[PDB]
mmCIF file with all atom_site columns, C-alpha atoms in Angstrom:
data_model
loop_
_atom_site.group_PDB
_atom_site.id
_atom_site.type_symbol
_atom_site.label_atom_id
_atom_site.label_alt_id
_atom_site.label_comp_id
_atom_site.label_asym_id
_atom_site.label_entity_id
_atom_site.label_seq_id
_atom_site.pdbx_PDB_ins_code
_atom_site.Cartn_x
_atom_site.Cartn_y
_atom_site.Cartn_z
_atom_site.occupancy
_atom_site.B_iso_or_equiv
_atom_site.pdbx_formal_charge
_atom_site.auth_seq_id
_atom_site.auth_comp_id
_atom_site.auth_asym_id
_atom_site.auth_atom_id
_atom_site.pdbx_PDB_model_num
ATOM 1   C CA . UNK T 1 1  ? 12.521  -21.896 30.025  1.00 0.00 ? 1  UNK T CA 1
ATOM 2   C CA . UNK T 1 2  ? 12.615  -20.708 26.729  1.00 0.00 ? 2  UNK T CA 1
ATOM 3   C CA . UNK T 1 3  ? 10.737  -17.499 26.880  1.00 0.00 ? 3  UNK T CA 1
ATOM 4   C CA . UNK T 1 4  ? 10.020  -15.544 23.119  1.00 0.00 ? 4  UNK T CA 1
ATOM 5   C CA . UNK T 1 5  ? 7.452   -13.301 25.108  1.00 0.00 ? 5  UNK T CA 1
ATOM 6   C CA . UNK T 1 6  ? 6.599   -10.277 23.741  1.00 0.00 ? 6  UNK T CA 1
ATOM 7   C CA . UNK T 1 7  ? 7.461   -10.138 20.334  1.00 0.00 ? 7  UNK T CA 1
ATOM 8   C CA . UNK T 1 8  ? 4.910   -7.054  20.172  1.00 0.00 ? 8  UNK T CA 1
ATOM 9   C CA . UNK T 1 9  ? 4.166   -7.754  16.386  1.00 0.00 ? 9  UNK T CA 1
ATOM 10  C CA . UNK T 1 10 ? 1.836   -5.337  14.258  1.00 0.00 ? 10 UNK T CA 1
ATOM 11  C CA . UNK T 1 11 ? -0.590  -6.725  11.202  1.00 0.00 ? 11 UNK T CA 1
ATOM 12  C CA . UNK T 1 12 ? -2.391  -5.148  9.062   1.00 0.00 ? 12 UNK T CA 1
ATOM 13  C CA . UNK T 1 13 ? -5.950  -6.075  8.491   1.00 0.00 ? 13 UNK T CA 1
ATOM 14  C CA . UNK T 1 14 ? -6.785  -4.361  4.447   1.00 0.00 ? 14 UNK T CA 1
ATOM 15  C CA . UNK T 1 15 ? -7.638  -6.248  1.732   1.00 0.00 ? 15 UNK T CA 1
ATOM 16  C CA . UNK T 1 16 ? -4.945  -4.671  -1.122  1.00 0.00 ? 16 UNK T CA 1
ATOM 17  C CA . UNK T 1 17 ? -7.069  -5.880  -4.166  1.00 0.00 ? 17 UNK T CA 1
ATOM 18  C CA . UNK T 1 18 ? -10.226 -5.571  -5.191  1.00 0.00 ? 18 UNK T CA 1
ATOM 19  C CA . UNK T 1 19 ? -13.000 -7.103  -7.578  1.00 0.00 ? 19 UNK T CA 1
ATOM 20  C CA . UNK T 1 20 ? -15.816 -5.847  -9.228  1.00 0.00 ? 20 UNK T CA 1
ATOM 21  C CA . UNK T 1 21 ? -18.049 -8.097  -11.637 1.00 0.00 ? 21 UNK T CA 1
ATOM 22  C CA . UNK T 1 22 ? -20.527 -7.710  -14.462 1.00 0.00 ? 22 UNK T CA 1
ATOM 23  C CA . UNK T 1 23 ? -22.196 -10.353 -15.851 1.00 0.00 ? 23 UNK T CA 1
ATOM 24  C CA . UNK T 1 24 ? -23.334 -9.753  -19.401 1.00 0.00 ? 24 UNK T CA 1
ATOM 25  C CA . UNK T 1 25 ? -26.016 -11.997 -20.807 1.00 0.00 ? 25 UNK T CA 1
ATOM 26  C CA . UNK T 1 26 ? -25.749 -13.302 -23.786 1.00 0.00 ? 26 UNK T CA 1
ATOM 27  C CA . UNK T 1 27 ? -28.112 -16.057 -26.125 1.00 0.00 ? 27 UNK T CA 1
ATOM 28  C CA . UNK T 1 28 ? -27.036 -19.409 -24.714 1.00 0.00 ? 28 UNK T CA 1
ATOM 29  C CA . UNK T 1 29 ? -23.331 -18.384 -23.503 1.00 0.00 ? 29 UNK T CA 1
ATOM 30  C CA . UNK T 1 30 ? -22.196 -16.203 -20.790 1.00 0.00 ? 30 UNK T CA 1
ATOM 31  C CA . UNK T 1 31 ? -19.534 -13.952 -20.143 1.00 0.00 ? 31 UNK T CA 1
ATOM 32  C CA . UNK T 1 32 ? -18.056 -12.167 -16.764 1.00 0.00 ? 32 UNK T CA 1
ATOM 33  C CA . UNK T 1 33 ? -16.232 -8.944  -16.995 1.00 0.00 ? 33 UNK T CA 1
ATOM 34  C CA . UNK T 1 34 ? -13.864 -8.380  -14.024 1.00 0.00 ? 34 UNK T CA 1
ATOM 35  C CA . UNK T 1 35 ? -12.670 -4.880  -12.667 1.00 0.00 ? 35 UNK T CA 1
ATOM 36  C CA . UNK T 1 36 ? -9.529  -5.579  -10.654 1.00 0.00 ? 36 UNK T CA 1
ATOM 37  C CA . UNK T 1 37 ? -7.377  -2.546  -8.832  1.00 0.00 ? 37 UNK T CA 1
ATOM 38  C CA . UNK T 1 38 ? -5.818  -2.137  -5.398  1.00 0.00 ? 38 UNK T CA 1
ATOM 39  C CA . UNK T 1 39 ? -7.598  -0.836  -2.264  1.00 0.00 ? 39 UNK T CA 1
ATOM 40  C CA . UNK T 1 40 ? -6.024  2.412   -1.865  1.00 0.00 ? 40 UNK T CA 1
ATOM 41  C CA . UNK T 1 41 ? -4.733  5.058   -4.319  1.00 0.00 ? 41 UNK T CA 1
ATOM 42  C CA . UNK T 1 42 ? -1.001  4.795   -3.077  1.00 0.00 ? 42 UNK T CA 1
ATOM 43  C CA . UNK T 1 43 ? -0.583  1.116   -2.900  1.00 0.00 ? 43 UNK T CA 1
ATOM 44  C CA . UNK T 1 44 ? -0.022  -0.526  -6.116  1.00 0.00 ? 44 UNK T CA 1
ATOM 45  C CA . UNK T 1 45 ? -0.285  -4.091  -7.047  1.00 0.00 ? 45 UNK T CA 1
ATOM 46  C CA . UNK T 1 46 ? 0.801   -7.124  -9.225  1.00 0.00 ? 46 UNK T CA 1
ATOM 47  C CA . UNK T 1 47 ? -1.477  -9.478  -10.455 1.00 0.00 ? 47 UNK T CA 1
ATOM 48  C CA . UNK T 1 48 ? 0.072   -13.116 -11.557 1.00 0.00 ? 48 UNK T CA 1
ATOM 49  C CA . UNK T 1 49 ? -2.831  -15.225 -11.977 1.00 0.00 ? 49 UNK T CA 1
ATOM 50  C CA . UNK T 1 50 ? -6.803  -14.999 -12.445 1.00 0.00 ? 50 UNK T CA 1
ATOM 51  C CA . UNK L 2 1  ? -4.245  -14.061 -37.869 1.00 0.00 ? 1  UNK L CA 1
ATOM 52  C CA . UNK L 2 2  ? -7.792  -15.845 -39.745 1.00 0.00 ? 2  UNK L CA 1
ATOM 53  C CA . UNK L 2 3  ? -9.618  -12.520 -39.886 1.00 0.00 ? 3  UNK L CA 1
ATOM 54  C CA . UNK L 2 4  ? -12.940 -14.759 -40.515 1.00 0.00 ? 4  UNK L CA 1
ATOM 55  C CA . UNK L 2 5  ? -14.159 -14.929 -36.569 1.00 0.00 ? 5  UNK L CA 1
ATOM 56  C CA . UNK L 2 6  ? -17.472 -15.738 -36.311 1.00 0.00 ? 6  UNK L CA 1
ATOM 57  C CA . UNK L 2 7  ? -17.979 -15.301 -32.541 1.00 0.00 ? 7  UNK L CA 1
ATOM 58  C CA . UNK L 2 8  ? -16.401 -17.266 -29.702 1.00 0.00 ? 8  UNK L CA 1
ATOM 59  C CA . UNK L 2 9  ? -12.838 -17.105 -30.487 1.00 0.00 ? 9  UNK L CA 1
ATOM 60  C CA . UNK L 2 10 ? -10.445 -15.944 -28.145 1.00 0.00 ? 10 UNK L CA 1
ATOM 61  C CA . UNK L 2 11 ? -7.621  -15.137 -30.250 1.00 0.00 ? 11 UNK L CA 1
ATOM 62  C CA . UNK L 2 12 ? -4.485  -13.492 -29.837 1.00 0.00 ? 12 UNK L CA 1
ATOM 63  C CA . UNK L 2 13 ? -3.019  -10.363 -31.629 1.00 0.00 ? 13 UNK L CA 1
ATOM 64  C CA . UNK L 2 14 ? 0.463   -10.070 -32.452 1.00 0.00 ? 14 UNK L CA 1
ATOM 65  C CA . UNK L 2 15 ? 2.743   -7.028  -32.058 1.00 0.00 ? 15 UNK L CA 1
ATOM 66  C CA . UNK L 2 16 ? 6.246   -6.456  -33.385 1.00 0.00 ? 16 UNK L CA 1
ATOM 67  C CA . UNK L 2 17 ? 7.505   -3.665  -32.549 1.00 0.00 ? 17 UNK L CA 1
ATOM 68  C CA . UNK L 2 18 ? 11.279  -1.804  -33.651 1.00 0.00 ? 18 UNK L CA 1
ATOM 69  C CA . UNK L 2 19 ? 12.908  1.432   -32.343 1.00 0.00 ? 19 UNK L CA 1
ATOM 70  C CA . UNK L 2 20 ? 14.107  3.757   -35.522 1.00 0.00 ? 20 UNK L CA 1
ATOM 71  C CA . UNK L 2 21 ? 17.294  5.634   -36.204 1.00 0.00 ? 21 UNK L CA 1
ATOM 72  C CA . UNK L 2 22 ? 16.072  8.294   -33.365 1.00 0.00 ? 22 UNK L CA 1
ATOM 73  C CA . UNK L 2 23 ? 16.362  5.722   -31.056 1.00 0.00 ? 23 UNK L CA 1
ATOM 74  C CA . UNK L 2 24 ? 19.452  8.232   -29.847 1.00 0.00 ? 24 UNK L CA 1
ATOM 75  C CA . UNK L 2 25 ? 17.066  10.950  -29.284 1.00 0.00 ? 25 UNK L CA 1
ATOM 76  C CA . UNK L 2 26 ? 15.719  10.879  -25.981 1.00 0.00 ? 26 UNK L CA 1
ATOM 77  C CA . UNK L 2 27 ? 17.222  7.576   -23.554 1.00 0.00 ? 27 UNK L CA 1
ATOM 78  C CA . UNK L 2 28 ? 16.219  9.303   -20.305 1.00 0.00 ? 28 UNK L CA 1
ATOM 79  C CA . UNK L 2 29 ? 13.288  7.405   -20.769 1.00 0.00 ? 29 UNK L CA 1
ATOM 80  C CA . UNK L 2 30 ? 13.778  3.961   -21.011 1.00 0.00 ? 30 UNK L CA 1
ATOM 81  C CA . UNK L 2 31 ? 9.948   2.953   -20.834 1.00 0.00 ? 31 UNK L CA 1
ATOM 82  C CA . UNK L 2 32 ? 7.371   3.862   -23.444 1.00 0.00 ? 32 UNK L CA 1
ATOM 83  C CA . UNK L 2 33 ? 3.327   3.192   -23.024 1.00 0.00 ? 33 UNK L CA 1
ATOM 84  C CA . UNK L 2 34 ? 1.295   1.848   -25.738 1.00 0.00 ? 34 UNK L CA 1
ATOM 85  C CA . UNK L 2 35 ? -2.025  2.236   -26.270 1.00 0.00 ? 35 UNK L CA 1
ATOM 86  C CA . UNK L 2 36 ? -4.303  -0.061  -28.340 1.00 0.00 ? 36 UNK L CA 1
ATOM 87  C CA . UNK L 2 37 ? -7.242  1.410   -29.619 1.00 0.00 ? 37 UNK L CA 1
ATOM 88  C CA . UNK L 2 38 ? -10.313 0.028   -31.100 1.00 0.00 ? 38 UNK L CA 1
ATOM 89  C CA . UNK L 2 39 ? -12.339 1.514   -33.956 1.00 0.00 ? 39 UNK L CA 1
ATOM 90  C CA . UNK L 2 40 ? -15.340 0.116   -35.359 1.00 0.00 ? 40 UNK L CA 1
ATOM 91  C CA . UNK L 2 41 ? -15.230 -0.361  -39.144 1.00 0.00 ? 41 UNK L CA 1
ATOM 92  C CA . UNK L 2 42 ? -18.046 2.320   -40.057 1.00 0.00 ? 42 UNK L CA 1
ATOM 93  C CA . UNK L 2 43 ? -18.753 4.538   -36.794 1.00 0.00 ? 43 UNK L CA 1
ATOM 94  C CA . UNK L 2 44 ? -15.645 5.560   -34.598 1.00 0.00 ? 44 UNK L CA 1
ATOM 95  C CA . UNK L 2 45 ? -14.248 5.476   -30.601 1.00 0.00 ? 45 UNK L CA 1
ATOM 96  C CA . UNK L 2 46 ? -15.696 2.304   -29.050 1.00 0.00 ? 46 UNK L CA 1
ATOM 97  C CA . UNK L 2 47 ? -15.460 3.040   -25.200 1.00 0.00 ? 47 UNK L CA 1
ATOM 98  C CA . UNK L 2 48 ? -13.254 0.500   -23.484 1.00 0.00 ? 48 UNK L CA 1
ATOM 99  C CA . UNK L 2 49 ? -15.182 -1.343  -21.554 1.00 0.00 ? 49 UNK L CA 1
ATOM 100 C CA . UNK L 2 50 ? -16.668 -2.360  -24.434 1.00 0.00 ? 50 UNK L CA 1
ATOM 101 C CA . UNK L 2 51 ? -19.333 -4.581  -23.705 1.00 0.00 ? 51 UNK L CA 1
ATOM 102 C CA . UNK L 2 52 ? -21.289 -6.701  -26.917 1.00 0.00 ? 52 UNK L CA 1
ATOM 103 C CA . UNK L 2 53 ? -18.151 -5.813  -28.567 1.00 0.00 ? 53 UNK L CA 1
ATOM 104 C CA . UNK L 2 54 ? -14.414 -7.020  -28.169 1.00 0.00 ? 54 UNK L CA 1
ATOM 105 C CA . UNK L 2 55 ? -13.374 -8.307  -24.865 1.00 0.00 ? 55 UNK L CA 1
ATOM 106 C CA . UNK L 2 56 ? -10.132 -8.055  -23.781 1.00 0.00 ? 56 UNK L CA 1
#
């Protein structure tokens, strides 16, 4: 009876980045400008892809 | 490079950059921050976020 009970585990439930968007309009093209930091002002983050 | 962009080109600028003689100055900092500003051609300090202007 292989018993791994209890493993008393903590997670974390914050979303570390964070997105804000502006869409500019423009005459027949488009553009989206994208405001990306972390959630809280001690945390900082790398970015690798968008 | 091609300084004749008429508007939807994303191109890329090019930096070289070279440490002097008084590159024996300082050494306790080993990282240096460089900031790229943006001027218009006739009227001064664009603000950068720089919308209807150059994206980034």
């Amino acid at each position: 009876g292989t018993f791994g009970e209890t493993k008393k585990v903590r997670i974390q439930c914050y979303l570390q980045l964070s997105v804000s968007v502006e869409d500019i309009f423009k005459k027949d093209i488009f553009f989206f400008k994208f405001l990306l930091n972390s959630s809280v002002r001690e945390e900082p983050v790398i970015l690798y892809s968008s | 490079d091609e300084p004749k962009v008429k508007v939807g080109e994303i191109i890329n600028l090019k930096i070289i950059t070279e440490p002097t003689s008084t590159c024996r100055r300082k050494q306790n900092s080993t990282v240096n921050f460089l900031d790229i500003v943006i001027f218009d051609s006739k009227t001064s300090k664009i603000l950068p976020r720089s919308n209807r202007r150059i994206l980034y």
